[PDB]
Design a binder for these strands. Structure first.
Lengths: 119, 322
RNA sequence: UUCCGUUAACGAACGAGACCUCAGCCUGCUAACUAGCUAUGCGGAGCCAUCCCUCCGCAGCUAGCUUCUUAGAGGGACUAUG
């Protein structure tokens, strides 16, 4: 049974958020880096937290992930989320409808409506 | 014409971290690894075309065991046999390759050490460290100066230093240091002051290069962007683009080539034309997870052969055609 | 009741874990005549005998001695890699 507990998992994520750039995919260098940024009370705690951060970086370098909010990917998921096409794909020119739709449109008095025609 | 493949040698269990080659005692290659050993290879240059082109480029000759942790960088004496190596135990060691014993020991680096380098007269020794300090040593392994400290103490970096090399011009000895603080500095052995701060990269630096004639100052690192600089006075000539991480950098001894290890293959540019003309891939393409990077490279004295040491303790040798 | 996650709950407190002791690795560091190993000298005993060779004794300003012993500082393992 090698389930990591709350302290390790929480600290791993919370150190991934603060320094994504200075971590890497090797365990040993990550050990040293984690020794240069935080104050832990045992070597075994450090080895465990660094071991959980290294494959967290492997899967970060792979794809997306839960709660940790990386800056370089939260803006990149915003830079292309305020994304526009050349012109709006919702166009009012060829919008074909079925009997009851023009029946309601005749009810409203917009019986003649540019771009509407039966199926 | 181009670089060609002969074979691969396997003498290190863990990732090879440096190769050094001599100029006067030629057939003696030395490579360091994360195994605390320090192997020395002998070259009769065999290619056994008897067993499916039996794979061995040479036969291992001698391990200099004795370091207490990973050996990070090694270099050779410019006049004889001696070698100098730095490791994660905070020490530097001088080995004698004719008997396999250590001869001297540079105690004093308060934390891990990442780079070593000799000098022309071999009296000027530099050590770069995770201490966030550089220290100069004599041949006796005793102190004369130590450049570092924070802004008040001096001009030392704030992150760890990652690599140092000399300027091979004889009327102006200097030392160039790349750092994890994303800054390259140039120093002087005259006063251990800095000539210039070559403020470059946006990510951490892991490599610095000085031209064989001491004219321009290739440095690589995190972003994948290599920047070439001016040794005379700190000017950024042009930028090159590799994409992935960068670990090792080197110049051809006489031909005007710059080589790099960039985590998906070895990329050789040209400086005659600021454009890539050679990519070098691992021979065995097995679909295991992300393939062995090349972690270090070096040219021979004559530039006839380049050596690449990778993450699996495998070293693959590259010759030229004609 | 370790964690992922689900979710009228959200945020926390103990217990588990962490932690401390001992044992396991270190020809790397610090050393050690209240621990020793090595070499050299003298002493004995064998012997192709004169030296060499082997086995013990003994004494030191022998050690570019600390492998063995002791005990300190650290390193090492994290399921790290496939």
């Amino acid at each position: 049974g090698r389930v990591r507990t709350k302290t390790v998992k929480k600290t791993s994520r919370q150190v991934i958020e603060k320094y994504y750039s200075r971590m890497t995919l090797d365990f040993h260098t990550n050990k040293k880096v984690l020794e240069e940024v935080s104050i832990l009370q045992s070597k075994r705690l450090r080895n465990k937290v660094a071991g959980f951060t290294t494959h967290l970086m492997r899967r970060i370098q792979r794809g997306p992930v839960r709660g940790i909010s990386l800056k370089l990917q939260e803006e990149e998921r915003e830079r292309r989320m305020d994304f526009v096409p050349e012109k709006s794909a919702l166009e009012v020119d060829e919008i074909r409808v079925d009997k009851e739709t023009m029946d309601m449109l005749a009810f409203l008095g917009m019986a003649d409506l540019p771009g509407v025609e039966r199926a | 014409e181009s670089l060609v493949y002969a074979g691969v040698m396997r003498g290190h269990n863990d990732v090879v971290t440096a190769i050094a080659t001599p100029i006067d005692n030629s057939p003696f290659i030395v490579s360091s690894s994360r195994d605390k050993s320090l192997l020395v290879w002998d070259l009769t240059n065999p290619i056994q075309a008897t067993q499916d082109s039996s794979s061995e480029y040479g036969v291992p000759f001698r391990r200099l065991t004795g370091h207490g942790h990973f050996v990070q960088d090694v270099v050779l004496s410019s006049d004889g046999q001696f070698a100098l190596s730095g490791s994660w135990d905070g020490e530097l060691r001088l080995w004698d390759l004719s008997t396999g014993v250590t001869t001297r020991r540079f105690v004093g680096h308060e934390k891990d050490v990442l780079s070593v380098a000799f000098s022309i007269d071999n009296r000027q020794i530099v050590s770069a460290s995770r201490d966030r300090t550089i220290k100069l040593w004599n041949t006796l392994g005793e102190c004369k100066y130590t450049i570092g400290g924070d802004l008040g103490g001096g001009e030392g970096h704030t992150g760890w230093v990652s690599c140092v090399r000399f300027s091979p011009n004889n009327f102006a000895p200097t030392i160039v240091s790349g750092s994890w603080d994303r800054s390259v500095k140039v120093w002087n052995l005259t006063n251990c002051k800095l000539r210039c701060t070559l403020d470059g990269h946006g990510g951490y630096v892991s490599a610095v290069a000085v031209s064989p004639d001491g004219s321009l100052c290739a440095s690589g690192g995190k972003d994948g962007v290599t920047l070439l600089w001016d040794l005379t006075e700190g000017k950024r000539l042009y930028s090159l683009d590799a994409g992935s991480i960068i670990n090792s950098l080197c110049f051809s001894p006489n031909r005007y080539w710059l080589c790099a290890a960039t985590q998906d293959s070895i990329k050789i540019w040209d400086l005659e034309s600021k454009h890539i003309v050679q990519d070098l891939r691992p021979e065995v393409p097995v679909s295991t997870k992300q393939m062995l990077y090349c972690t270090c490279l070096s040219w021979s004295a004559d530039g006839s052969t380049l050596y690449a040491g990778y993450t699996d303790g495998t070293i693959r040798i590259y010759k030229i055609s004609g």
